[PDB]
Design an enzyme around this catalytic site. Structure first.
Site, PDB file in Angstrom:
ATOM      1  N   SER A 113      39.996  36.985  31.828  1.00 57.07           N
ATOM      2  CA  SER A 113      38.861  37.250  32.741  1.00 57.07           C
ATOM      3  C   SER A 113      38.051  38.521  32.441  1.00 57.07           C
ATOM      4  CB  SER A 113      39.282  37.182  34.217  1.00 57.07           C
ATOM      5  OG  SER A 113      40.290  38.127  34.513  1.00 57.07           O
ATOM      6  N   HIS A 166      37.473  43.312  35.430  1.00 55.89           N
ATOM      7  CA  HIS A 166      36.245  42.545  35.568  1.00 55.89           C
ATOM      8  C   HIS A 166      35.002  43.416  35.483  1.00 55.89           C
ATOM      9  CE1 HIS A 166      38.912  39.547  37.949  1.00 55.89           C
ATOM     10  NE2 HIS A 166      38.995  39.338  36.647  1.00 55.89           N
TER      11      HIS A 166
END
Ligand SMILES: CCCCCCCCCCCCOCCOCCOCCOCCOCCCCCOCCOCCO
Ligand SMILES: CCCCCCCCCCCCOCCOCCOCCOCCOCCCCCOCCOCCO
Ligand SMILES: CCCCC(=O)OC[C@H](COP(=O)(O)O)OC=O
Ligand SMILES: CCCCC(=O)OC[C@H](COP(=O)(O)O)OC=O
Ligand SMILES: CCCCC(=O)OC[C@H](COP(=O)(O)O)OC=O
EC number: 3.4.21.105
Length: 192
Positions: A113, A166
């Site tokens: 991610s 992220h």
């Protein structure tokens, strides 16, 4: 299959799938021990660890959402800027996001991610700037970018890592894309 998509994108997607499948028929234990970010002064020298943490996933949705987004946008990057560019963004995003996640939460994180956000960040500013090499996401992959900032600030899901990966990922992508956009313009300056 390929016959169109990028070779690096495909290799990375297939590696993730193979390592996950392996996690399911014996033990994630071995794999998690060898693959996690350095959590030990003695592991600082185990250089694959700065990147390998991105090849391990913790659930079917975790890997399903990560690979979907990476296959689509990692592929766009590969087909648009080359395989070297994608490989590089991958190595660097993996190392940087892991570095950042580790500082705030420790070496207990796995998944692609952080690379996805770097990839989304890269495509986003590239599209925004030299708008041409792309023709819009789809209409949904553009939304899941605003309503996804809550996917880590005020947890609506949880990408078994944390939002530090992220956010630093997005930042890596945004900065890299701005630089490439610039380098692009600079050289076109003397072309008809
Ligand atoms: C409409 C827009 C089009 C966009 C589509 C783009 C398609 C691109 C193709 C990308 C390829 C995606 O590949 C990802 C597949 O990953 C394989 C790994 O396993 C997949 C599992 O499939 C989902 C299973 O979900 C199970 C849910 C139940 C449990 C929830 O998670 C816990 C997992 O526990 C393990 C259970 O065995
Ligand atoms: C009660 C509530 C609890 C509190 C919860 C709070 C919720 C917030 C949590 C979010 C965590 C915030 O963390 C953010 C971390 O981000 C910090 C940023 O630092 C990391 C970014 O690092 C960037 C490093 O430099 C960028 C690299 C880019 C390099 C690009 O290469 C150059 C390109 O060269 C040209 C080659 O073609
Ligand atoms: C890319 C850095 C991670 C390399 C690694 O040690 O983990 C993956 C290995 C094999 O993958 P390679 O990409 O190194 O062949 O485990 C799977 O069998
Ligand atoms: C950017 C990826 C590699 C950077 C690194 O060497 O990481 C070292 C950090 C801490 O490094 P300092 O810069 O704080 O000494 O700890 C890792 O476990
Ligand atoms: C954003 C442009 C200015 C930032 C910078 O000093 O960049 C130095 C090099 C790249 O320089 P450029 O000439 O490509 O901007 O590395 C950046 O991380």
């Amino acid at each position: 299959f390929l016959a169109q998509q990028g070779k690096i994108t495909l290799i990375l997607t297939a590696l993730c799938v193979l390592i996950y499948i392996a996690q399911q028929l014996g033990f994630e234990d071995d794999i998690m021990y060898l693959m996690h970010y350095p959590a030990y002064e003695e592991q600082d020298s185990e250089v694959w660890r700065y990147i390998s943490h991105t090849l391990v996933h913790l659930s079917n949705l975790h890997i399903l959402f990560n690979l979907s987004w990476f296959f689509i946008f990692g592929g766009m990057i590969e087909r648009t800027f080359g395989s070297v560019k994608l490989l590089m963004l991958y190595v660097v995003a993996s190392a940087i996001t892991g570095y950042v996640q580790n500082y705030v939460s420790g070496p207990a994180f796995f998944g692609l991610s952080g690379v996805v956000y770097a990839v989304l960040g890269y495509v986003f500013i590239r599209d925004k700037l030299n708008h041409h090499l792309f023709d819009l996401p789809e209409g949904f992959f553009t939304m899941l970018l605003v309503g996804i900032a809550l996917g880590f600030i005020s947890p609506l899901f949880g990408v078994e890592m944390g939002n530090a990966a992220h956010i630093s990922g997005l930042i890596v992508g945004l900065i890299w894309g701005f630089i490439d956009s610039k380098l692009r313009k600079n050289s076109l300056e003397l072309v008809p």
